[PDB]
């Protein structure tokens, strides 16, 4: 219970960071997986 | 005589304990077999996670973003364009394999 306390404390101090992770990672996974959908490859825009 | 003095308090205590115990009984009867089965099934993932517990903190650097390592993202990707260095190899080994 004590080690769970310290783990949960470091998690609770960074609960806003967990929420930010979920928020900013749930809004681009479809967009990122879109590129590698056409075929057995992934498109790239080689600017140079 | 003293029991007659505190009959109301005794009845209140019994009723409060019964109120607690009814909810406790319904919870512990509706979650006996399900909890037993969930623990029996979760034993193995717990053991295997204990095996991999030392390496989990290092794996979190990659196990979420499989091809990207979190440490050097802010300097590899400078905004809208991923940086890259192209090594166009035309050796006969690459030609034979490709």
């Amino acid at each position: 219970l004590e080690q769970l306390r310290t783990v949960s404390d470091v998690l609770n101090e960074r609960k806003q960071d967990l929420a930010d992770i979920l928020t900013v990672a749930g809004k681009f996974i479809t967009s990122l997986a879109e590129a590698l959908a056409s075929g057995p490859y992934f498109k790239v825009m080689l600017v140079n | 005589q003293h029991f007659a003095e505190t009959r109301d308090l005794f009845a209140d205590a019994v009723t409060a304990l019964g109120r607690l115990s009814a909810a406790a009984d319904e919870t512990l009867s509706g979650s006996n077999a399900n909890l037993h089965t969930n623990l029996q099934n979760l034993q193995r993932p717990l053991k295997q996670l204990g095996r991999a517990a030392p390496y989990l903190v290092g794996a979190l650097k990659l196990i979420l973003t499989v091809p990207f390592n979190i440490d050097n993202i802010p300097k590899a990707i400078r905004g809208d364009y991923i940086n890259v260095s192209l090594k166009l190899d035309l050796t006969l080994s690459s030609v034979d394999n490709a």
Partner: protein, 174 residues
């Protein structure tokens, strides 16, 4: 009855008091921290983030697995008015080899006399001219229901396998 009940009640009262004096003060803190972190990750925005991740990650995983070419190693990335009206695809190299193919399930392994297609569970025939949908008599793996087909493959997939790909009963392979 009553003597054992009294003795056990006294013992469990002492044990409970020791337990609560020992563990309650940290158990409360653990419960509070768990509640706060779960509430932080179950706000509507994290809720939809988790929902979209759970929805869209398996397909990303399957596609990136299909990206990798075992024989050439690494990942294949082709380069790319909006774009040119004409496009070409000269040829496709041998990404895998017959020796390098391992099946995730024992039902997806083709029987002797048939080979695998780019859609797992659909088994074509193996001959010199079998490339390009030219051999009739294909079979489909059991439990492959729910896959739509084009008319070209459906004309070559026999009645039984085509029915199984949409209907209930599973075919009996020869």
């Amino acid at each position: 009855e009553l003597a054992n009940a009294l003795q056990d009640l006294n013992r469990v009262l002492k044990t409970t008091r020791e337990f609560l004096d020992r563990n309650g003060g940290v158990l409360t803190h653990d419960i509070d921290n768990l509640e706060q972190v779960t509430t932080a990750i179950l706000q509507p925005e994290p809720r939809d983030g988790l929902e979209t991740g759970l929805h869209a990650y398996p397909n990303l995983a399957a596609n990136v697995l299909n990206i990798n070419s075992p024989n050439q190693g690494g990942i294949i990335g082709l380069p790319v008015f909006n774009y040119l009206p004409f496009g070409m695809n000269l040829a496709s190299t041998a990404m895998t080899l017959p020796k390098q193919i391992a099946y995730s399930e024992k039902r997806l392994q083709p029987p002797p006399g048939y080979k695998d297609t780019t859609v797992p569970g659909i088994w074509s025939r193996d001959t010199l001219f079998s490339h390009g949908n030219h051999e009739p008599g294909w079979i489909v793996a059991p439990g492959m229901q729910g896959v739509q087909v084009q008319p070209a493959t459906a004309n070559m997939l026999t009645p039984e396998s085509l029915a199984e790909l949409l209907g209930g009963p599973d075919i009996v392979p020869p």
